[PDB]
Design a protein around this nucleic acid. Structure first.
Length: 45
DNA sequence: ATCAATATCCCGAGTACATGCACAGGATGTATATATCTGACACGTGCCTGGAGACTAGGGAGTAATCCCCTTGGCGGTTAAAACGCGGGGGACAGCGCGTACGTGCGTTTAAGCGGTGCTAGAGCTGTCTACGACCAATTGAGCGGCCTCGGCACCGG
């Protein structure tokens, strides 16, 4: 009745006390900024 | 130096809502054991508070003259009090509903720990240099003086 019954978490807050859904968008962009983007490389910034 | 007219207190009776006690229970006070650092105790230290001396003089203690504010007494005008009647709004009972407190679930946010390092503090002697003492020349103001003009009374004229 469902595609899968063995669905696994992708970094939720079941263990810790962080946000249950996912990281905040500001945090997502802050983490993505750490990538060694090239000088002419496109990004979300 | 008393008697009427009120007002108040005392006592008795019908009455009722709030005090005081028992019940079920639940959640906070208690007993036991562990970790640990805050504060008692000792030590030296050196800042500074307490004691006395002598000299200067600003300030206080004592006296005398006196004009002024304080206080008592007296009187006129009136603003409030006491009590009457008139009039309105405070006061005593039922129906809604929207606020306030629990209950439940979530995540953002401060505490804690550990290096890192400019950063506020203290004594250093630093040097300027405003600001406290002393002297001196500006205006402001009141207490006086000189002189002139006006007005009332005594003397002579008709």
């Amino acid at each position: 009745k469902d595609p899968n019954f063995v669905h696994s978490g992708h970094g939720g807050a079941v263990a810790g006390k962080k946000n249950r859904t996912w990281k905040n968008l500001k945090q997502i962009l802050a983490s993505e900024r750490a990538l060694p983007w090239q000088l002419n490389d496109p990004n979300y910034f």
